[PDB]
Design a protein around this ligand. Structure first.
Ligand SMILES: Cc1cc2nc3c(=O)[nH]c(=O)nc-3n(C[C@H](O)[C@H](O)[C@H](O)COP(=O)(O)O)c2cc1C
Ligand SMILES: Cc1cc2nc3c(=O)[nH]c(=O)nc-3n(C[C@H](O)[C@H](O)[C@H](O)COP(=O)(O)O)c2cc1C
Ligand SMILES: *C(/C=C/c1cccs1)=C1C(=O)NC(=O)NC1=O
Ligand SMILES: *C(/C=C/c1cccs1)=C1C(=O)NC(=O)NC1=O
Lengths: 313, 313
């Protein structure tokens, strides 16, 4: 019985990794994620220049999930590039690098610089088109024209295999259009579904107040709230992008939740809110719990059930 | 002391009502909602002609909420119009009628016939622009040019105050744009936020199967999953639509959840999933719970706290 995978020219001990933004901002965070049982890690989305992000409180967690408006905060591209070039131990596990420039120009600027590092070291790009917390800069992937431009320019500037972090969609016509944009770009080898469900609002009944400070309390939702949305987007792109990989993200707290993502079509399974709450010990739990489900069902590998969710009649 | 209110030139005993589609399809259902302690009721969304709706199973509920792909099912407009014109006892509470034609022409045809009964009896139109479960017919309010065309034509054809059942949005630019489209129409006097969170996917781990039959298992989400999304939309439209009322729908299981909706800006509060699961006895519980929270905080009216959610700094 076995959780191993072999994809994008890398070997993964298991399908689990952090979700971008969780436990991956500093060198310390990145070492911790490397020392953990995860199959891979991804760095914090970065802009070209370092940034502070939004005023605190900007993240809060509850029994059913999390709300966040982290905004810009990252140590900057130079730092994440050096991590990938000089510091990351690739013998431990594969590394993905998330970028989220504020203009197509900014992204292209960065991906020009990442390419030689990608060629040399094997770092994998994840391009973030779905941040819901920068004011005056809505989720790029909700503007399909903008999306096609970003992907053109980045494919052209980078010229190597990469993936895209997508926002959730809620409408069958949007699934159809978005997968079709993506399928114009053969260098898009993976699609990560989903980023936070944007612009929710948590209100505390006792205080009568919002619980995060930026944007009058509005922020992206993670965790239990979003699992059926995440599974929908995972399967919707799995069905519509038969030449690409789908990475699942959203609502994973258990090996059962990972099992569902995998049934829906996920290759790698990312863990945001639950990892933020539980810490990196979650990875050993998720592995054991997923193996227990596989054992009970007689499944010996991931590809025996990946994408094999059953429909009714 | 008592939760009574006036809106839209009617009087309501409390802000609670069913959500359209729940406990409101048949004459029996409507009689049962009329007999309950809700402050109002809304009929099931209807098409000009009767329809059966989708294959069963089409609704399933879980601890965290519900998924549904009910699709077309209603007794047809003639039935709901006759309920409004001849059977409803307006002495007990107000009635809303929900319409959901498949084209602008169908909606125009219905509202032309509803207009006289609205003039005579005061039945209130809730126009549904957000059904996530007709194949080929995506949520009208996710296409802003289509939404403007529907609201121009209905306003011209109806000529009396009405409301719109909105889908959730997730993007501040979308809130800005949708609210500005609504604000182009002075006859749109209330905005119901939200319809179900469209096209989620529930998967049963043991059976490895989706749980509803239509649309390969995809359906709209209700219940605990959607409360922060609902609150966000309620507040977003409450802030942007100062000359309209906002009706709250989504995730209400308790008087506390109702309190949050009303803090966010809700005038009426609609109950879907929770009502489907608990039945109409829920209304006495919701009233009792809301009165109790109000007491504990020293609020005597709903006006004292509606829209008074606090932000940080
Ligand atoms: C504190 C926080 C920071 C995040 N930062 C990023 C980020 O920098 N880039 C990104 O693509 N997504 C970011 N996200 C989104 C997550 O990667 C993930 O898509 C979302 O939380 C849903 O997964 P979950 O349900 O496991 O939390 C962040 C989420 C949280 C909670
Ligand atoms: C079985 C079912 C049928 C529904 N039918 C309708 C409908 O005919 N028209 C409509 O506007 N919304 C319909 N909805 C959406 C609800 O009115 C409501 O917007 C949604 O369920 C979210 O509220 P909740 O969280 O309380 O369930 C339906 C919901 C359910 C669960
Ligand atoms: C926004 C992206 C933020 C970045 C900060 C520096 C570079 S990119 C977020 C996102 O993608 N997902 C979230 O849930 N929260 C965010 O703030
Ligand atoms: C669809 C609207 C369905 C109609 C059937 C006859 C007339 S209109 C739904 C909706 O608006 N919200 C839901 O959650 N489910 C539906 O099926």
């Amino acid at each position: 019985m076995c959780l191993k995978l072999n994809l994008l020219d890398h070997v993964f001990a298991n399908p689990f990794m952090n979700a971008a933004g969780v436990l991956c901002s500093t060198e310390e965070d990145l070492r911790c994620m490397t020392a953990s049982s995860s199959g891979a890690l991804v760095s914090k989305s970065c802009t070209s220049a370092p940034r502070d992000g939004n005023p605190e409180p900007r993240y809060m967690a509850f029994p059913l999930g999390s709300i966040n408006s982290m905004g810009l905060p990252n140590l900057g591209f130079d730092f994440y590039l050096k991590y990938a070039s000089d510091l990351h131990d690739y013998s431990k596990k594969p590394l993905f690098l998330s970028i989220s420039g504020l203009s197509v120009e900014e992204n292209v600027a960065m991906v020009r610089r990442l390419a030689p590092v990608a060629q040399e070291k094997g770092v994998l790009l994840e391009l973030n088109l779905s941040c819901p917390n920068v004011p005056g800069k809505p989720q790029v992937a909700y503007d399909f024209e903008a999306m096609r431009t970003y992907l053109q320019q980045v494919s052209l500037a980078y010229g190597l295999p990469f993936g895209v972090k997508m926002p959730p969609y809620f409408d069958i016509a949007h699934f159809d259009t978005a997968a079709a944009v993506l399928n114009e770009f053969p260098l898009v080898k993976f699609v990560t579904c989903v980023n936070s469900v944007g612009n929710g609002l948590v209100i505390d009944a006792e205080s009568e107040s919002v619980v995060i400070k930026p944007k009058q309390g509005f922020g992206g939702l993670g965790g239990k709230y979003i699992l059926p949305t995440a599974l929908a987007n995972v399967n919707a792109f799995y069905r519509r992008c038969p030449d690409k990989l789908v990475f699942g993200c959203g609502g994973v707290y258990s090996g059962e939740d990972a099992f569902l993502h995998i049934l829906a079509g996920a290759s790698m399974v990312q863990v945001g809110t639950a990892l933020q709450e539980e810490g990196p010990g979650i990875f050993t739990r998720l592995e054991d719990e997923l193996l227990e489900i596989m054992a009970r069902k007689g499944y010996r590998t991931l590809e025996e059930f990946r994408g094999r969710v059953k429909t009714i009649e």
